């Protein structure tokens, strides 16, 4: 997260870290057994880490649970990043408490102009690299579809939306991939792509979760 703020320990209790010997992506806990992340975060041997603040120090509230299965969206296209969504099933149910909690799926899509909360342990610089210890947060508005399409001509599908600041300076970034965009208490987006981070006229592009609720529900009802 570039140009954000320190969230505060466990204030984003649905935020997870995906670990494969190191943190590599975020995700969102949607019930005791399932995490939503980006399909571009797919790899074998994922351990889901819940209740994290400092990802490099065991602070006492963590639950580390191995993934039993990963299900990439059937229409995910890694070239265009269309349908950039994946479900990860935990080997055992997380124990839900104040510091580890699920986030609601949307019943309707979010509105342009709505301020959303984006979070992660990704790069905090727009040029150069610096990775934070503790979870970072950014409040960012959903942009109009026409401004989103103008920013990325020929690349924005109906399964994507833009959020952020056209002036630059505030954005998600590498390492935030797969993490939450929560608007009005609903998981509305997944950190997906963008040209660099926090670049002028290049806002963040996010998987449009409201389009996938049917697939999510049917998948978790059968796996
Ligand atoms: N909002 C952005 N500008 C943005 C967000 C996410 C990415 C994804 N990078 O994938 C590589 C990785 O995370 O390791 C790029 C740009
Ligand atoms: Ca920790």
What are the structural domain ranges in the chain?
Answer: 1-12+103-210, 13-102+211-222
Residue 211 CA, chain-centre distance (Å), reads 15
Residues 13 and 75: their CA atoms lie apart, in Å, by 30
For residues 45 and 108, what is the distance between their CA atoms, to the nearest angstrom?
34
d(CA 21, CA 125): 23
CA gap 140, 165 in Å, rounded: 7
Q: For 164-192, give the DSSP string.
A: S-TTSS-B--TT-TT-EEEETTEEEEEEE
Q: Which helix or strand (DSSP H or E) is residue 119 part of?
A: strand 115-120
Q: What is the CATH number of domain 13-102+211-222?
A: 2.40.10.10
**DSSP classification of residue 19:** E
Domain 1-12+103-210 -> CATH class = mainly beta
Ligand nearest to the CA of residue 172, numbered in listed order: 1
Experimental structure resolution, Å: 1.8
Q: Which of 193, 195, 200 to mutate to test ligand 1, by most ligand atoms within 8 A of the CB atom?
A: 193
**Residue 59 contacts residue 100 (beta carbons within 8 Å):** no
CA distances to 37, 138, 173 from 120, rounded to whole Å, are 12, 9, 9
Tokens of 88: 């990860």
Method: X-ray
The reply to whether 1-12+103-210 and 13-102+211-222 are identical in fold is yes
């Amino acid at each position: 997260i570039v140009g954000g703020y320190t969230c505060g320990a466990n204030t984003v209790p649905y935020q997870v870290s995906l670990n494969s010997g190191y943190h590599f992506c975020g995700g969102s806990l949607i019930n005791s057994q399932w995490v939503v992340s980006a399909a571009h975060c797919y790899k074998s041997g994922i351990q889901v880490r819940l209740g994290e603040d400092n990802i490099n120090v065991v602070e006492g509230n963590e639950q580390f649970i191995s993934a039993s299965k990963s299900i990439v969206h059937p229409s995910y296209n890694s070239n265009t990043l269309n349908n950039d969504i994946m479900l990860i099933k935990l080997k055992s149910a997380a124990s839900l408490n104040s510091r580890v909690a699920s986030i609601s799926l949307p019943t309707s899509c979010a509105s342009a102009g709505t301020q959303c909360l984006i979070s992660g342990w990704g790069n905090t610089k727009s040029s150069g690299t610096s990775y934070p210890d503790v979870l970072k947060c950014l409040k960012a508005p959903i942009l109009s579809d026409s401004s989103c399409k103008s920013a990325y001509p020929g690349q924005i599908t109906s399964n994507m939306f833009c959020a952020g600041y056209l002036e630059g300076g505030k954005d998600s970034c590498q390492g935030d991939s797969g993490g939450p965009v929560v608007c009005s208490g609903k998981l509305q987006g997944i950190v997906s792509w963008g040209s660099g981070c926090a670049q002028k006229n290049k806002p963040g592009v996010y998987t449009k979760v409201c389009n996938y609720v049917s697939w999510i529900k049917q998948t978790i009802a059968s796996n």
